[PDB]
């Protein structure tokens, strides 16, 4: 039964140090000349940094001398010119090597911060260099003599001390030393010593340093690597066709910088190699070596010294180092992110004949896009002899092909994506409708997801090729399945703006209208009553109608009624489907309510019949708009009748407060602060002036006297509807327009009292600038900042899939409605819908299991919950989820844009990360960074302290800059005494027992504590309840899960407290423990032990702890990761997401979930 040898579905990646022999396993040869190409006959001279003799033929299947040019003589090597003939593709694969005159030192490990060559020698930085540039000799194995090994002498000393001990000690200088040094040390050794001293001395700086040192070490041993290797003797050179030497037009040339850089090492080396044979004076060759080690590090990570310039050009050259892709951090940096075939884009417009599952793509793009499918399909039906020609037909745009193409298209969706791809919806699959124009046409309803208007936004398109994709495209990405924001249960495919004006319009009622009070059979005769010119839309009318209600056993029950409604609202009811209450359209309908109508149709008749509703909800919503002829002309913007009146009234107050100020009844900061209120009040009144008047003054009259009703002025109906406007903005059209604050931040004690319908005067405008400018500026930034944020989250969620089914723990968190002092800042129902419980729920009274253990709370359930007065709930949430290395479905909850519980595999991490960082843009200590404060885990400036331990308190010693405070346990050993700076105000009661985690100073508190002290179900509520005050404040609906799930990553680490097998103090993944304690619990031995303590880790600091090193080395400092990762010879067993993408295999979630699983079992399988 064979292993293998050849090539195979490998997995996982090993990185490590590089044996010289091993390196030589790589080179097809030693570059040894600094030449390039010929100079006249632009051939490549062998053998030198481009060659063929080594790297490969230039031209597919062709020897260099050229004796052998046939697709015949392949693996042959020209007798003359060291060339196997093969494709030229090798000279982009093959590598080289060079032998060095002097062993020479690897700049990554010598400086990539904690210098491996450093701490491994436990020998300081400054010296080694000192040894290297030949400043001073260093001891090595001095043996029983007079001196330590890693000790160092000056020349003279070395000489003095040479004369005393002839041999029997060793001292060198120059690379070889360190080379000498490493080869020679034995690790295994120090450790056991290091091991003891760890045990011999008990001190925190120490075991911090010590045990932390050792932990690095035996890692190295565990690697495989050899520290003699951190030094270079042979150097691999990257293949030529990647540091190419292309010709340009006008036959100037261009190449990558490595070639300069290369040419430098080669040069020095040789001349040096040369020098030896001249037996040149060691004063020079010393210098030479010193130069070589320059050229090298020039090569490798230019920037860690004097920074070799670019030749020719001022500017600095490009070191391998610099050419690492991903590269990033810290931080940035986007990744554009490869370009791509089958793709394109343009300007986009409306298209409202579009049924939500489609979009209008222009004949012309659609042509060039699907070109091959066309080439094939053409010759299949055999309208074309052969493709060559098939091309010519489409080249010719023959009429036939247009018809054809239609065929290729039929059920063939394409991808449509817009500007900054935020949440997964930034890409949505449509079926395409062929179209003239070079515009893309958009389904309006969708606009609102992408965020696209039509003032020039361009959306770009893609093609799903694979059979697969066409399903992926159709099942998941297809327009329709995305209509519940995965951010937050509500529909996202709500009635936008143009429309709800129409709807709102219809579902309205004028006091005394063309038909006030008749009665019609049903809407059928209702509309007929209209297009006939007989009724007004909104003339009140009773009508016969039927709603249905599927109240009974899954079953649809009908019901007729003489509902007392309007004509419009009648006519709408035509659109509504079955199991909906007429009650739903009875009223006026805001966009506020009308999305809510939509959700409901979905949570009761579900997808399809929610959808086709929504198109029809639109199609209509436009039509009565256009019919209504709403439009705005100056006359609509009513400046309240009494505006100017008050102004002068409050204009009074001020001359008053002035009088008093100069009479110094009252002060300046006083006065100011006084005045500015009254201006404030006025604006509230000149606000609520018009709004009181604008609102309703529609005073009209039926049969009798006068009645007044909610107006029909064109603009009210805008804001009233939710189409557009904000009474905040109105107030700027009619009444006074706010107050401007000058740049200071310091608001100006004289509001912009005029408005838009009136002139603005110079000065009015002017102050008005700075503002709108600052604003623009803000947005420009908040958006730069929103981003870098998300980049971090997804950086850290991500590798997180809904893996386990139901972890099966009873452990959950406790939900209360939010109640911020006054009124409930947010209901308990919103919080809890969609979660799955810990334990069965009892009524008010008891023995009454309402809901049983873990149930997924639907709407009904809730409604049941709300009927019973029910009021707080323990719930399953992913910080609870016992499942390790994933997230049980049950611990989670339900959401999707689809309604039912999460399905295994979905990538909830990302889709968490998304729904946060996305709306972040619109944020306003506080606001955005105040957010980063949550997740970054930053202590505030001045943090409270709390009852460290429960137990009675007492103050000991005195004021010595800090008062030691000694808590005293009723039972336990009392000794807790903390040293506190008393130059801040206390709170605690002085002879009082203090429940650990009480307020012992007041002011902000630092989460790590709350965690540590108060608890997880505690902290975990802090992070959210407080992230939540921000978004909530901003009308921004994000559901808690997501945050929790971030939080979860925050606390991936934990600190042990005892042992048996781990290493006593260490900081480790609650993961690996949760597994390892298990492996002792009934497993091997109790041994013992171990216990831990959970740690709060800042997101960013969380991320950079990825089992996957590829993953992580994309987020932070890179140069580091590799450097530090290659030394402990890590392996990356894949599994994570990105890493699989980089190396471009298949995603282990999504679809690819179903697949990977199928393999991981075969790994460790027999």
């Amino acid at each position: 039964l064979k292993a293998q040898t050849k090539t195979e579905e490998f997995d996982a990646i090993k990185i490590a140090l590089a044996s010289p022999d091993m390196i030589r396993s790589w080179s097809f040869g030693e570059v040894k000349k600094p030449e390039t190409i010929n100079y006249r006959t632009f051939k490549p001279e062998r053998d030198g940094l481009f060659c063929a003799r080594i790297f490969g033929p230039v031209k597919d299947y062709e020897c260099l001398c050229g004796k052998y040019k046939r697709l015949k003589h392949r693996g042959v090597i020209c007798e003359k010119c060291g060339v196997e003939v093969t494709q030229t593709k090798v000279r982009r694969e093959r590598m080289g090597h060079i032998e060095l005159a002097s062993p020479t030192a690897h700049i990554w490990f010598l400086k990539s911060l904690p210098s491996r060559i450093g701490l491994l020698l436990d020998m300081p930085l400054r010296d080694i260099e000192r040894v290297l540039y030949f400043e001073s000799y260093v001891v090595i194995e001095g043996g029983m003599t007079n001196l330590e090994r890693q000790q160092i002498l000056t020349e003279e000393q070395y000489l003095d001390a040479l004369e005393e001990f002839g041999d029997e000690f060793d001292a060198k200088m120059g690379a070889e030393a360190i080379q000498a040094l490493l080869k020679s040390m034995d690790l295994e050794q120090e450790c056991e010593q290091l091991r003891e001293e760890l045990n011999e001395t008990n001190s925190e700086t120490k075991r911090k340093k010590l045990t932390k040192r050792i932990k690095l070490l035996e890692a190295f041993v565990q690697s495989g690597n050899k520290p003699e290797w951190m030094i270079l003797t042979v150097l691999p050179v990257l293949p030529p066709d990647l540091r190419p030497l292309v010709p340009l037009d006008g036959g100037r040339f261009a190449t990558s910088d490595l070639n300069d850089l290369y040419r430098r090492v080669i040069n020095r080396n040789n001349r040096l190699k040369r020098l030896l044979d001249l037996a040149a004076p060691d004063i020079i060759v010393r210098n030479e070596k010193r130069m070589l080690q320059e050229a090298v590090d020039a090569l490798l990570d230019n920037g860690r010294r004097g920074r070799a310039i670019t030749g020719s050009n001022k500017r600095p050259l490009k070191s391998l180092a610099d050419m690492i892709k991903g590269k990033q951090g810290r931080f940035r940096q986007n990744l554009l992110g490869k370009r791509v075939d089958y793709s394109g884009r343009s300007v986009i417009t409306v298209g409202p004949y579009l049924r939500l599952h489609q979009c209008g793509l222009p004949k012309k793009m659609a042509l060039e896009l699907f070109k091959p499918f066309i080439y094939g399909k053409l010759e299949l039906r055999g309208l074309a002899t052969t493709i060559k020609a098939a091309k010519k037909m489409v080249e010719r745009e023959e009429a036939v092909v247009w018809d054809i193409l239609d065929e290729v298209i039929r059920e063939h969706p394409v991808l449509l994506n817009r500007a900054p791809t935020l949440h997964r919806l930034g890409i949505q699959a449509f079926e395409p409708v062929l179209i003239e124009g070079k515009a893309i046409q958009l389904h309006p309803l969708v606009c609102a997801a992408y965020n696209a208007d039509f003032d020039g936004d361009q959306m770009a398109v893609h093609v799903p090729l694979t059979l697969e994709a066409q399903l992926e495209a159709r099942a998941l990405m297809m327009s329709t399945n995305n209509i519940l924001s995965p951010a937050n249960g509500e529909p996202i495919i709500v009635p936008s703006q143009d429309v709800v004006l129409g709807l709102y319009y219809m579902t309205r009622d004028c006091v005394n209208a063309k038909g006030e009070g008749m009665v019609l059979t049903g809407p059928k005769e209702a509309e007929r009553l209209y297009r006939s010119g007989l009724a007004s839309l909104h003339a009140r009318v009773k009508v016969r109608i039927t709603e249905y209600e599927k109240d009974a056993n899954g079953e649809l029950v009908a019901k007729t009624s003489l509902k007392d409604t309007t004509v419009g609202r009648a006519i709408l009811w035509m659109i509504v489907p079955k199991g909906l209450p007429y009650s739903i359209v009875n009223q006026a309908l805001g966009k506020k309510a009308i999305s809510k109508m939509l959700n409901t149709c979905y949570r009761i008749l579900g997808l399809k019949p929610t959808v086709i509703f929504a198109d029809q909800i639109m199609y209509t919503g436009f039509a009565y708009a256009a019919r209504s002829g709403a439009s705005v002309g100056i006359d609509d913007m009513v400046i309240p009748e009494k505006k100017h009146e008050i102004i002068s009234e409050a204009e009074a107050e001020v001359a008053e407060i002035q009088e008093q100020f100069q009479s110094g009844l009252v002060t300046a900061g006083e006065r100011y602060n006084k005045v500015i209120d009254i201006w404030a009040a006025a604006n509230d009144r000149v606000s609520k002036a018009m709004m009181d008047n604008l609102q309703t003054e529609t005073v009209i009259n039926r049969d009798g006297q006068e009645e007044k009703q909610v107006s029909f002025n064109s603009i009210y109906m805008m804001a009233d509807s939710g189409a557009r406007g904000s009474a905040a903005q109105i107030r700027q059209l009619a009444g006074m327009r706010g107050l401007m604050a000058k740049p200071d931040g310091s608001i100006i004690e004289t509001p912009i009292t005029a408005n838009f319908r009136e002139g603005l005067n110079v000065l009015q405008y002017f102050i008005s600038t700075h503002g709108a400018r600052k604003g623009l500026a803000d947005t420009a930034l908040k958006t730069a900042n929103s981003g870098y944020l998300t980049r971090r989250l997804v950086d850290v969620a991500q590798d997180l899939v809904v893996t386990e089914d139901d972890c099966g723990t009873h452990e959950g968190i406790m939900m209360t409605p939010v109640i911020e002092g006054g009124d409930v800042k947010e209901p308990l129902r919103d919080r809890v819908l969609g979660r799955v419980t810990a334990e069965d729920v009892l009524k008010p009274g008891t023995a009454d299991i309402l809901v049983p253990r873990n149930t997924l709370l639907h709407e009904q359930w809730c409604d049941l919950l709300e009927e019973n007065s029910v009021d707080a709930v323990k719930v399953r949430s992913v910080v609870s989820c016992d499942t390790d290395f994933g997230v049980c479905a049950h611990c989670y909850g339900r959401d999707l844009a689809r309604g039912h519980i999460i399905n295994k595999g979905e990538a909830i991490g990302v889709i968490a990360a998304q729904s946060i960082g996305e709306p972040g843009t619109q944020l306003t200590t506080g606001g955005l960074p105040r957010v980063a404060d949550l997740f970054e885990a930053r202590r505030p400036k001045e943090p409270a302290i709390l009852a460290e331990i429960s137990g009675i308190v007492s103050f000991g010693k005195e004021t010595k800059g800090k008062r030691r405070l000694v808590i005293t346990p009723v039972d336990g050993s009392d000794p807790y005494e903390e040293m506190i700076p008393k130059w801040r105000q206390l709170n605690v009661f002085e002879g009082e027992r203090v429940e650990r985690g009480d307020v012992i100073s007041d002011g902000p508190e630092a989460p790590h504590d709350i965690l540590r002290l108060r608890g997880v179900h505690a902290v975990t509520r802090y992070i959210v309840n407080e992230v939540q005050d921000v978004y909530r404040l901003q009308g921004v609906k994000i559901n808690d899960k997501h945050i929790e799930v971030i939080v979860r990553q925050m606390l991936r680490k934990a600190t042990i407290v005892n042992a048996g097998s781990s290493d006593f103090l260490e900081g480790e993944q609650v993961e690996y423990s949760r597994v390892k304690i298990a492996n002792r619990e009934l497993e091997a031995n109790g041994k013992v032990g171990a216990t831990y303590s959970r740690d709060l880790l800042g997101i960013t600091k969380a991320s950079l702890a990825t089992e996957s090193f590829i993953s992580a080395a994309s987020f932070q400092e890179t140069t580091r990761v590799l450097t530090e990762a290659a030394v402990a010879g890590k392996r990356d067993e894949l599994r994570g997401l990105k890493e699989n993408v980089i190396v471009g295999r298949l995603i282990p979630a999504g679809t690819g979930y179903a697949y990977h699983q199928d393999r991981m079992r075969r790994r460790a399988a027999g």
Partner: protein
Amino acid sequence: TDPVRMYMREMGTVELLTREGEIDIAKRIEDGINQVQCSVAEYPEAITYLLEQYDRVEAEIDPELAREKFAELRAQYVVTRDTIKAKGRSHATAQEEILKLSEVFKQFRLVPKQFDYLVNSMRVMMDRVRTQERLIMKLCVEQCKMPKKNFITLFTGNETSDTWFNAAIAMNKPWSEKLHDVSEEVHRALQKLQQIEEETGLTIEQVKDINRRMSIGEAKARRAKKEMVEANLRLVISIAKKYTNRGLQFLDLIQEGNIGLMKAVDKFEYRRGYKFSTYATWWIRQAITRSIADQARTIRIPVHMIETINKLNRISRQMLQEMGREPTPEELAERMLMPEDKIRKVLKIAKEPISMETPIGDDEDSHLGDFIEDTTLELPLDSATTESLRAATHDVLAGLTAREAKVLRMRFGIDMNTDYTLEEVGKQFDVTRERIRQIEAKALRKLRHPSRSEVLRS
């Protein structure tokens, strides 16, 4: 901190000189020559080798004159061989013609190449001696458990014969009896040793000393010159401070300089009142300039090419002000020995030329080479068709006589390997040649119906 200062500061140990320590050395050098010259003047096989090649270069600069001195030399040897073997004047006065001969050896120079050979040849031959010698000790001292105290007293006498071997076994000491287990080995090493006494034609005993006095003589001078150069670090810089930034970075020219320096010290002769420096300058300006031009641009380039350039570069800047405008290659070549395109061909290989990793816009910080399209690779719809070609064609050959098909396909490698000569295609099939030709043409006659391939054409 920074390589350059180190070199400087390193050089800081001034160690300046006057005329005195100047010449004072030059002899110290020269001694080590003779001392070694003399040292080597001593070697029979150094000279008997001199004979063998002489016979090889003469069996294949005035030849007859060369034929003459070889006689004086050739004469003076054979006599001396008898002042040994005939043992007249027991290496006292027979010693003297041995000396006369060596004198003959001590005059005139040669070719440094055969030299380092002999130098080597001696010492490699010296190797085999301590080669065979390193054998006997591990086999008697460490092997026979025999003390090294007793090994140097008796072996040292001869170091070739077996006088100590069979005299350390009869001493009836406790370490003696062990010497037997190596009797096949000791016999074999003393053999090759005396053999060297035969190959060398000199006692292994006396052959060390001479080789050494070279070796030291070696040091004396080695040591010496080293000193000389260190004197003039400062020289090099000055001048090398000239050639700077010329498509070559500092330390480089200067290293090279200290080569050009270090060279000069060799070819010199202090017996020349010409003062040492200005003899350096040349040999320094030598390497550092000739250094530059051949290794400085990313494409090499011949010299004259360099010069023929700067001829232009200078002229054009000379030309410019003449015609305070602008110089056109016709004009420029005019002012020239030069043809013209020959010039134009010249222009193009200047320019160093630009780095692909140059920045261009910042449309998304682009890079140059982010834009160089490939030209090798084949288009997909371009490759695909090809695929249609083999097929649709293979689609056709089947419609023909299975005998003709294999006759075309042979002519065109198709589905096969090398394209078969439209002759030798016969020869394989016999019925040559013309015979087959007709068959060929029969194919082509079918293109009544090639609406397939016809179209795969354009």
